[PDB]
Ligand binder design. Structure first.
Ligand SMILES: Cc1cn([C@@H]2O[C@H](CO)[C@@H](O)[C@H](O)[C@H]2O)c(=O)[nH]c1=O
Ligand SMILES: Cc1cn([C@@H]2O[C@H](CO)[C@@H](O)[C@H](O)[C@H]2O)c(=O)[nH]c1=O
Ligand SMILES: Cc1cn([C@@H]2O[C@H](CO)[C@@H](O)[C@H](O)[C@H]2O)c(=O)[nH]c1=O
Ligand SMILES: Cc1cn([C@@H]2O[C@H](CO)[C@@H](O)[C@H](O)[C@H]2O)c(=O)[nH]c1=O
Ligand SMILES: *Cc1c(COP(=O)(O)O)cnc(C)c1O
Ligand SMILES: *Cc1c(COP(=O)(O)O)cnc(C)c1O
Lengths: 810, 810
């Protein structure tokens, strides 16, 4: 059909068809008379999977032969989404499979919709790991992703009566064709017990054992025949576990609960024991696997030359003391030598400055669950503080500020401090974020070891986020500059010479319209809701959180509604406001925000006077697969976090690459995006980080804005009086109270400039040609945000390895 | 290699090899450089499995087309054992696979030892179901086995310090290549709730729902291209289950625990709630599946003409009231019509007369868990008793004796009475057992409905129990009479004309010697224990239970030991006494018996004076795979249960078919075996059922035997004084006390005749030629004990269907 989707050769199509029929028969044990669409999806999945195996086996054999330095990316989250289309894209099998299935009388798109998302993540942090795996494979790095195979991923979100309802994500119900269980590589992990100090060294004894069984999933690079591995551990009880008889067998669940479910929190630390067990479980199994592979290549001096461990936030921070435990207690290295190896091996990536999101574990928890690790952490702290004391003699407050151990009600271990002390590199995820780290929360550390601090601006993979989800745009682009940009996104800059090209301007606008039509149809198909495809698609999709300020968006929507009701026969650019995202189960304010959004829609969407000029829709169950549908259809991307709170953001990059203009604050990567495209091509508004600090020093008083802005006052009175909740007048009292008395994110402070900026957006939308030319300027300068660029920087500046675009013999 | 193992054609061997390499690559994702023996086993299993699929699909399509009457065998146990070799045997692929693997540089026998036993049963009852499935497929019956897919089967038995230790049987750890999950056919099962009586009919509401997911396993008939299905249900929690959030997800285990583990009791009823849930779970899911298939063929009058439900004991007895519930409550049939259909559809098989083994559920349990079923059971009882009252006016005691409801401390439901009332056929499993049923426990029922009572003597499949485990014997037999006997065991009678054939006598004896050498080697391989292959192999393998009297065997062993110590230089036929079997975890006396056996061995096996003249070995972890090894190597089969307690026995039949002579009581099938071979060719001893009754009427006093038998007295004094337990003098006080004061099984009463009979056995063993001729007379008359004969009788006399030996086009 389209160029970028590969060739549909005569031989290959014939081959695909026979293997499809083979799997349907032998693998699924069905015939065309009883097979259902799901049966067909699996037949196709196994057929495509077969094409991965050969490359997968030789890639791993290749690394064994050449023995390059290995990169281990440790993360408690891998937000993978669907795998079928992505695999076809990277193997250049899309058109061939589309043709083969077509000839078999099947619609491949219909089959792709049957696959369950691998929702092993919460949002940005988990998606970043997924994009990174893709880029590492595309750049020929010998990388391995290590995590946990959660039986239940992020919950499926249902909206009932305008409220969020959660239901288990039983994603493995029908089986996972992509994974390969490797029970032969099962490893033991220890918990509890006590420490015994003998003649030579300490010993961790009387521990409870839980087995870690690995499941391997292939990670194909883009058309380079490289297939890396993502290894996820599953918890298994030993067979002598607890060994009345029946009860002993049933109690095995206690041990296996470790890999049962993903904690649904985003940017919020919950110090639960089960979460701590998950963190140590992944770290303990992974390190044994790493050391085993290292020895199968005694000389731990070369360990840092053959191994790089990247910590995705502090979740896997226990890798530092676990590595020390193994080297000191088991391998018998002297402390100093062990510490040198550990620091040169580990690197830490920070993703937030919000205090409530930082991991600070109570000492009594570590004391009971991991007694040996607590001792090692105290020793690390002692030696670290001696260094601080020697560098800043007499600065006693610095000593208490930098300590890994926090004193107070209950003593806690600051995992971020542990990571900085035990890593040779610490990085932020966007320039402004990395600078804030050095000026605020990690200032003392930066002054002690300035060389450790770096920046690695985030990125997204252009395979899934352009070619896969927006083939139409990928096609018209390839028509002008070729296909090389797919693995070298900087080439998009060549599109600048087409900004005045009437043919291109028309094609870009046509693709957007088609995407919007397709999405508008989807909304009626699976959700039954009518929308006007000619309206401006205003969307904000991301997890629900006060710092992301979905509430500011709500204030604007209500403002637009009140303005229409005031002057009904006045023309206004039609808009479809879409907001989607999940709220953590115990995050009350976040759940109230969801209810507010649906409540607004209930009023706005049924007001005769408004007509099709304004619609407010809440996108249910936002996840990777849904993102791939709504992002290509967006006109306006809402990135309005309070300046200084969104470390980077990545959804913002996905919208920019897909033809949507951005309205946002100078926060996270928004700053670099505007810098790349030019501020004139971005809709920037609101307080800058410096402005927020000035307001805090002075004291934020929301009452002042309420008193000076009539339109704002009206909205607050509508909320308090029950205008949006007739049957429950005080339903939103908590929201009004927070906004008026304890809003940490200054929603009112950016209200005026936001509304004004939104007016400028509507003004531009009225001029199709100029709107599209600005879009072209954005797409053309989005190259810097490819995760390929990000990974190349990690490789050269942190891991010490050179990326490669060389194909492997298939 | 050998004839009965099929042809090793040039084309097929080449084909097998390429498919083996294909699976190793694509399925297991490995190469010859990293593949382990387990990897090779799986490659072979998938290769053989492929040969089953084609036949499996067409067999099921065949039944759909011809729509014959369907046979549903409901059982909570299916003791399948290994599947690889059995599949090769039934498909005539053994020699081809042996050659193909040989050419690949692999030893197939070594690979077969890697497969885990599917130990979804406890013993005889579970093994009978497995043999039956095999015979039903071989006889072309449209049969389906329905049970539960236990995550953990019968526990693995370890012997530590002479004591039984139990460990979880994690048989699915490495995956099960034979099964095929069918999540698309998942069905809901209800529990708890309450009954609501509305205008039209009652309704079961407010129930808790548990999903039943089916897993299908193919059951190949012997070389007839028929492949039936064994469908096992697995418990799954609904996704809205219990829907803090984390806890709700973890609590899903509560619902899924239903299919977690097999209750390890044998001939003993344990009224636990979880067991009741398992029983209803299998019945509820199965009946919905049956009705669904029936409708896809409104006219329930023809239901009995298209469906037959066989209840393996009372475990699935809830099928009777569940069928009534569906027909009355859901289909809206009038009670009388529904009852007619139910009775004509159901048939019940009883397997014991021991009071402690009969299921008698407390009403309060049924009341809480299955309120609607309790009501239906009371109604059934009411109408049944009205019939009894009309047939035997004024006989009030008969009414209370026959009631389904037992009064007393706590009211209970007698499930056996429920089964008789709701079934058109009730059968025992051996002639003597079926007669005892009519004269004792079911006497009142027999007098009311004599036509319902039948006998169906048990049998074993000659495929697994001869061809598979003893190819050597199968071969020399085929050499003389051909291969037809494998599916027509009665033909073995032709071997009688060879009883005086010197060549045959020599071959039979040679095969036994080779089997014994192979087993003697195995004992040193996996268990490190030296034994003399020239000694008489005396073995008793079966679950440990007081009624089976392993204790009587122990008394004989000690007697032999004391006699040797008394006259050391006197010649005695060398013996290796082997006893094996598992004890239920909470069966104290059974665990003490195991300890006694190892204790005896500890003394006997290390006494210099005894030498290699006597050895006592306890066969650890007796299971199907071990039975296939030890039975072909046995010389003497111990079947010594107290007359009237072993309903039938099946191990006895396995020994007879494999060339071992039998020493036993006139109990169960032993009676018919001796009748077939001739009492002169059997070693019968002890009390007959009539003798046991006389002793009970008079009162059994063990003291009398102790006072009159010096050798017996000596043994009891050795046990009481600590001769077999130096460090723990009173260790066996419980055993001595039971034997002397409350032995329900009269061990002492059969001691004298047993020892005398054993002397006659030793006398015959000294004459190799005559021992072997008697063996030939046994093998030649074992034809009646083929489960093919048993199933043909069930088909014609109970299910109303004709068996067929017609091949299906492959
Ligand atoms: C799961 C979760 C909870 N919370 C809040 O944490 C506060 C301090 O523990 C509580 O008082 C409040 O009720 C919670 O909704 C958040 O802010 N974000 C979150 O993701
Ligand atoms: C601590 C934390 C950060 N992040 C996000 O990680 C993304 C990838 O680095 C950033 O772009 C985004 O700004 C962050 O808020 C999450 O999603 N969950 C989290 O718990
Ligand atoms: C599991 C089990 C228990 N028991 C006995 O049941 C008796 C009555 O409940 C108990 O007093 C005794 O301690 C048990 O060992 C048996 O006989 N057979 C068995 O299979
Ligand atoms: C009640 C019951 C019977 N049986 C056996 O079933 C076999 C097959 O019918 C018989 O040969 C044998 O005599 C019985 O004791 C068991 O194994 N477990 C049991 O719980
Ligand atoms: C890209 C992505 C995110 C991150 O979006 P932000 O707006 O940066 O928070 C979260 N969820 C999904 C499903 C995503 O695809
Ligand atoms: C045949 C068999 C049984 C039944 O043996 P009996 O002596 O009749 O009780 C029990 N266990 C296994 C493993 C068997 O193969």
């Amino acid at each position: 059909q389209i160029s970028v989707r590969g060739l549909a050769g005569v031989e290959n199509v014939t081959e695909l068809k026979k293997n499809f029929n083979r799997h349907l028969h032998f693998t699924l044990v069905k015939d065309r008379n009883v097979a259902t669409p799901r049966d067909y999806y699996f037949a196709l999945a196994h057929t495509v999977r077969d094409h991965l195996v050969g490359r997968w086996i030789r890639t791993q054999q290749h690394y064994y032969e050449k023995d390059p330095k290995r990169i281990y990316y440790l993360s408690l989250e891998f937000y993978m989404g669907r795998t079928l289309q992505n695999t076809m894209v990277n193997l250049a099998l899309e058109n061939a499979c589309d043709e083969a299935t077509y000839q078999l009388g099947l619609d491949m798109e219909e089959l792709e919709e049957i696959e369950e998302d691998a929702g092993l993540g919460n949002g940005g942090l988990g998606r970043l790991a997924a994009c990174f795996l893709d880029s590492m494979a595309t750049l020929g790095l010998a990388a391995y992703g290590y995590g946990i195979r959660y039986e239940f991923g992020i919950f499926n979100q249902k909206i009932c009566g305008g409220w969020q309802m959660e239901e288990a994500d039983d994603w493995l119900r029908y089986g996972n064709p992509w994974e390969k269980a490797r029970p032969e590589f099962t490893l033991p992990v220890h918990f509890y017990g006590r420490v015994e100090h003998t003649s030579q060294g300490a010993k961790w004894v009387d521990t409870q054992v839980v087995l870690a069984m690995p499941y391997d999933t292939p990670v194909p690079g883009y058309r380079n025949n490289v297939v890396n591995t993502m290894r996820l551990w599953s918890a298994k009880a030993p067979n002598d576990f607890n060994l009345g008889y029946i009860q002993a067998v049933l109690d095995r669940n206690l041990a296996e609960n470790i890999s049962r479910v993903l904690y649904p929190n985003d940017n919020f630390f919950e110090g639960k024991e089960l979460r701590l067990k998950q963190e140590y479980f992944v770290v303990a199994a992974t390190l044994q696997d790493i050391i085993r592979r290292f020895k199968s290549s005694t000389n731990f001096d070369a360990f840092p030359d053959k191994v790089a461990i990247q910590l995705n936030d502090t979740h896997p921070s226990l890798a530092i003391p676990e590595l020390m435990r193994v080297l000191v207690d088991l391998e018998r290295l002297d402390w100093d030598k062990a510490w040198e190896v550990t620091v040169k091996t580990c690197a830490y990536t920070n993703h937030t400055v919000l205090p409530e999101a930082l991991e600070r574990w109570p000492v009594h928890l570590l004391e009971t669950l991991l007694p040996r690790h607590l001792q090692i952490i105290y020793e690390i702290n002692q030696r670290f503080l001696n260094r601080v004391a020697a560098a800043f003699p007499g600065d006693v407050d610095r000593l208490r500020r930098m300590s890994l151990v926090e004193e107070g009600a209950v003593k806690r271990i600051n995992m971020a401090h542990l990571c900085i002390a035990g890593s040779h590199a610490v990085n932020g995820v966007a320039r402004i974020h990395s600078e804030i780290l050095k000026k605020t929360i990690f200032k003392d550390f930066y002054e002690l070891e300035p060389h450790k601090f770096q920046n690695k601006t985030n990125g997204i993979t252009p395979r899934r986020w352009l070619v896969l989800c927006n083939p139409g745009l990928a096609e018209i682009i390839a028509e002008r500059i070729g296909e090389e940009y797919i693995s070298d996104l900087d080439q998009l800059r060549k599109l600048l010479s087409y900004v005045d090209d009437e043919a291109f301007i028309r094609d870009v606008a046509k693709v957007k319209q088609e995407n919007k039509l397709k999405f508008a149809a989807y909304l009626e198909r699976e959700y039954k809701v009518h929308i006007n495809p000619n309206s401006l698609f205003d969307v904000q999709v991301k997890r629900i959180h006060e710092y992301k300020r979905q509430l500011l968006n709500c204030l604007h929507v209500i403002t637009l509604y009140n303005r229409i009701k005031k002057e009904p026969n006045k023309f206004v650019v039609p808009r479809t406001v879409m907001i989607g995202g999940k709220a953590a189960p115990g995050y009350h304010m976040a759940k109230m925000i969801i209810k507010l959004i649906t409540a607004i829609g209930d009023v706005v969407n049924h007001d005769p006077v408004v007509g099709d000029r304004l619609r407010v829709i809440f996108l249910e169950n936002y996840r990777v697969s849904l993102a791939e549908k709504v992002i290509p259809a967006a006109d306006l991307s809402e990135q309005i976090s309070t300046a200084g709170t969104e470390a980077s953001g990545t959804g913002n990059m996905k919208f920019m690459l897909n033809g949507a203009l951005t309205i946002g604050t100078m926060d996270g990567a928004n700053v670099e995006m505007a810098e790349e495209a030019g501020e004139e091509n971005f809709f920037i508004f609101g307080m800058r980080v410096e402005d927020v600090d000035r307001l805090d020093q002075r004291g934020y008083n929301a009452q002042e804005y309420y008193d000076r802005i009539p339109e704002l006052r009206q909205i607050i009175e509508q909320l308090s009086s029950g205008f949006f909740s007739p049957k429950q007048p005080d339903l939103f009292k908590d929201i009004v109270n927070m906004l008026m008395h304890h809003d940490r994110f200054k929603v009112f402070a950016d209200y005026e400039e936001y509304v004004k900026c939104q007016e400028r957006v509507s003004a531009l939308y009225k001029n199709p040609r100029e709107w599209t030319r600005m879009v072209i300027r954005n797409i053309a300068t989005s190259g810097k945000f490819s995760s390929d660029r990000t990974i190349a920087q990690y490789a050269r500046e942190i891991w010490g390895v050179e990326p490669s675009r060389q194909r492997l013999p298939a």
